[PDB]
Amino acid sequence: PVTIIIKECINLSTAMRKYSKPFLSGFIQLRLMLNKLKNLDNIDSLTILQPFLLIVSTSSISGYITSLALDSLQKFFTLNIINESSQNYIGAHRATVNALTHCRFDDSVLLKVVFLLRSIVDSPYGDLLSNSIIYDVLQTILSLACNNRRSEVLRNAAQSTMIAVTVKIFSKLK
Amino acid sequence: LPVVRQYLNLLLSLIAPENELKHSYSTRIFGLELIQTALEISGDRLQLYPRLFTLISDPIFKSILFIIQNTTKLSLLQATLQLFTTLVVILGNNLQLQIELTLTRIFSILLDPSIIKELLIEQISILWTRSPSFFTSTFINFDCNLDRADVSINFLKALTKLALPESALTTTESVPPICLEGLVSLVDDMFDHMKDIDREEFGEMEILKKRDRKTEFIECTNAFNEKPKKGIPMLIEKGFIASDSDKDIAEFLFNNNNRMNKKTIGLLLCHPDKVSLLNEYIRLFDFSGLRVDEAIRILLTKFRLPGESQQIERIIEAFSSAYCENQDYDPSKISDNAEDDISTVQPDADSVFILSYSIIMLNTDLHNPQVKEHMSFEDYSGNLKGCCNHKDFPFWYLDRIYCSIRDKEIVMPEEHHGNEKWFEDAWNNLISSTPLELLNFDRAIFKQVGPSIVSTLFNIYVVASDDHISTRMITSLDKCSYISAFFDFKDLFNDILNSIAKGTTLINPMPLVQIPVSTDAVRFGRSFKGQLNTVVFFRIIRRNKDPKIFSKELWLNIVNIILTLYEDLILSPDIFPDLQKRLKLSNLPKPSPEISINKGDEEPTEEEIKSSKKAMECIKSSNIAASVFGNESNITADLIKTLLDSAKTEKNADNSRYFEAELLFIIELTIALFLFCKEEKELGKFILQKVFQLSHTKGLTKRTVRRMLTYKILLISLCADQTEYLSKLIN
Amino acid sequence: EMRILMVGLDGAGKTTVLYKLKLGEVITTIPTIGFNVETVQYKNISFTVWDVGGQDRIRSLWRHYYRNTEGVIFVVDSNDRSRIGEAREVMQRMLNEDELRNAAWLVFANKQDLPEAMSAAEITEKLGLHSIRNRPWFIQATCATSGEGLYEGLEWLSNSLKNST
């Protein structure tokens, strides 16, 4: 459970070091902070995801590292390590979807983020998002679908996942 | 649920090394990630299901070991090591044979380019980086039981070999710090399990009995491969074998071949005296329902064959007498036109003796690299004209023998490792075989590694210059000293303190000047390393409980340090003003400096004095007098003898300034250390003789002699029945 | 590229001698299992040495390799007086096959250091080399550690081969 966390940080840190030759300081802080403890139940889950949020949010970094970070988040929500028992999981998911809507960082990362939005919103945990965040989500998938410059297959990815989130949203009128 | 079995079969086909040409490295990376993320979800539960655990045990580890061996791409190895680390973390308990093979082999390649070694170090650091407990756990799974080879001790030795900056020539700079992190974490964690257990309370469980039994096994095997006759009797005396009968010897030799050296068994077994051992050992193997080539493979996989011919004749003659009776005989079903039938061949013992020699002939003639003239199938087939009750052999039979030997050798795999084509048999050979209590495991863990780690750390402490790494090294060394002191390991603790005392740069120009300034003082102040060394060296002194651990040279270094500190007027000599107050005497005569300037002559310039002031503040903060002498425990007869021996008897030209001062200082110390001393019957004569002999030194001013007479009467008050010395004093 | 056989009883002495011969330069990993197969160089000559066991049944298997072979070697120990009776039987047995007209025969009386080592003339008398004719033979004395005239024996082999070829 904690092995996978510093596993992911090891992978992203060595990728960053290979690519480079401000984020690594907090990354090693995450490494040292998660080294000691046994189980995640002691501490909050916003800080463990926070370096991933910082890398994915800002646009100064190329597609390799942000693709690796998005695959890391995919592994996170696939393995369900950020469980409801963990403290402040609502805030962690809210921050994840708030940062993820900014489609900034060629076309691989767009499909990775929109698949991640599908996996979050379709899941029951996606019911905990706020109205502003989910509205921004709908805005960014609409921007992806509307575009013509982008590849058409990415457009069909946006079309299908838009259909999915619309179904999930409109099921809530009961 | 069968779909899981088929899916893991498909991933076996993806990952396995046979399908190298028909797949891309991207596909292999994807397959690696697939089984990696599949393992995490139902990891331990795979133990319950036997077929899936077998699939994850034998073949997929063949794949993982083949990939880590002969891979050059960095992304491929990055994906490969992740699955291995997760499998060690989750399923490390059950499949530990493969883990031991992987760790020995990966550490073998590790200690031989730079980037692959860096990635390997960074990924294998996963195992210890989870928590310190794994580093203990591997001791109580791998090295404890006698069956498996040593891992953990080799782990520490290899890792601390790698931690040196000396590897920077052959490795990139990213390896040393992450290497050092594991050892630092281990020694830091070992300090955590110290507070609860008392020092005197601790000082064995069934688990450590295996470790005690193991250590003689290595020496026994070394003696055995040194020569054969000296090995078995000591071994039987130790009682590993049930008795001296040949049956028990065969029972040993068949089961635990991996421990022993194959060439030793090959040399011993062919001895013409031990034919009974030959017969008894030959019975243990099975050949029922197998072809002849599989029979020779089973014969020679367990032990190496001897080179010379008559020994092969003896060994195969031993083979035939048992292999003939092993297989039941049915003369009724003899046939020639039949194909792929084992029962059709029922050779007489001489016939199968000749055939068994024949496959050896084929292997040696064909596949020996030296022989230029390879064999031919037709002449080989004709060579066995009339060697089964004077009759020829089936064509398909000898054809299959020739095809089998052509496709694959007859040779043991363990020596001929590293080749790309040979890992199949080498892998297949192995799997045919298959709070107070916590501290007790760690004694042996220190006992093999304790010097080496310390030496490595001290090498870094000599090479490093940054403040942070140096102080981290110093506090880790302090915790190592705590571990040595609590565990009652004497020579090691002496090694740390002696190396520190060499490193502090106080144990061996410009004369002394007024805030004294000196060569030693400036050397102390300007250098940060010794500056931080002194404070730890006198922090460790305070906390010592058992004074027996100190050695002679350690005490000598202590008196040299305190004397050299007092030489330059750093430390005031009033360690025991309470003794003076009780005896109602004034303070000591401080040693004079050479020149005293108040505030081209060599005045110490303003840019030189700051080192002296920094040294002043550091030594004042160290609290030397309360450290060495203030604590009650350190007072011992060894300190008295070494201190009073270290007085300067003779007065050279140079030492005129501090001669009488140091002479008074030593005895002023020894009175207080005698007074707190519990027993006084024996050492009293020693201190009296040394002090009275020292009083007879000439040239002393009358002030110090008046001071010296005051001690003698107090000595004679304390010590017992020395009438002659009192008479000498009176006279 | 010629072949020579070698026959004896004591494995350790034969193996040590064989390791002693092959030193022109040693760059190798491991030999294959089975029989010892070794190389020996000399100025203008190179030779390959195989091993042979002596008994009735298997010596038929050694027959075809004799088509290219032209030489034979022995090793006989000094203080092994008991087992000369076993050795000379094998010596006479090797003469039994009649296709070996061109078989060069040698002896290496290993361990000629101990005081009870029988004389070379007495070695000939005991082995029984006098009462046979019609073939070439040679006898020589050598020591495992110190060495004595082994290269002279190889020179004799080379000169015999150049006399033949």
Author numbering:
A (entry chain A): 11 to 31, 71 to 154, 162 to 230
B (entry chain C): 329 to 440, 455 to 545, 550 to 780, 799 to 872, 888 to 893, 903 to 987, 1004 to 1135
C (entry chain D): 17 to 181
Task: Please give me the paper's original passages concerning this structure.
The budding yeast homologs of GBF1, named Gea1 and Gea2, localize to early and medial Golgi compartments where Arf1 activation orchestrates the formation of COPI vesicles destined for the ER and earlier Golgi compartments. Here we present cryoelectron microscopy (cryoEM) structures of full-length Gea2, the yeast paralog of the human Arf-GEF GBF1, that reveal the organization of these regulatory domains and explain how Gea2 binds to the Golgi membrane surface. Gea2 and its paralogs possess an N-terminal DCB-HUS regulatory domain and C-terminal HDS1, HDS2, and HDS3 regulatory domains. The HDS1, −2, and −3 domains form an extended helical repeat structure that is contiguous with the DCB-HUS domain, such that the HDS3 domains of each monomer lie at the distal ends of the homodimer.
To further investigate the role of the regulatory domains in modulating the action of the GEF domain, we trapped the Gea2-Arf1 nucleotide-free activation intermediate and determined its structure by cryoEM. The conformation of nucleotide-free Arf1 in our full-length Gea2-Arf1 complex structure was nearly identical to that of nucleotide-free Arf1 when bound to the isolated Gea2 GEF domain determined previously by X-ray crystallography. Strikingly, a closed conformation of the GEF domain was not observed in the Gea2-Arf1 complex cryoEM data; instead the position of the Arf1-bound GEF domain was similar to that of the open conformation observed in the absence of Arf1. We note that structural predictions of Gea2, its yeast paralog Gea1, and its human homolog GBF1 each adopt the closed conformation. These structural results suggest that binding to nucleotide-free Arf1 enforces an open conformation of the Gea2 GEF domain. In the closed conformation the entire GEF-HDS1 linker is ordered, whereas nearly 20 residues (residue numbers 781–798) at the C-terminal end of the GEF-HDS1 linker are disordered in the open and Arf1-bound structures. As this conformation of Arf1 is incompatible with the Gea2 closed state, the GEF domain likely switches to the open state concurrent with nucleotide release, adopting the nucleotide-free Arf1-bound conformation we observed by cryoEM. When bound to Gea2 in its nucleotide-free state, Arf1 is positioned such that its N terminus is oriented toward the membrane surface, and we predict it to be in close proximity to the lipid headgroups. Although not present in the construct we used to determine the structure of the complex, the N terminus of Arf1 folds into a membrane-inserting amphipathic helix upon GTP binding. The conformation of Gea2 when bound to the nucleotide-free intermediate therefore appears to prime Arf1 for membrane insertion: GTP binding to the nucleotide-free intermediate induces formation of the N-terminal Arf1 amphipathic helix in a position optimal for its insertion into the cytoplasmic leaflet of the Golgi membrane.
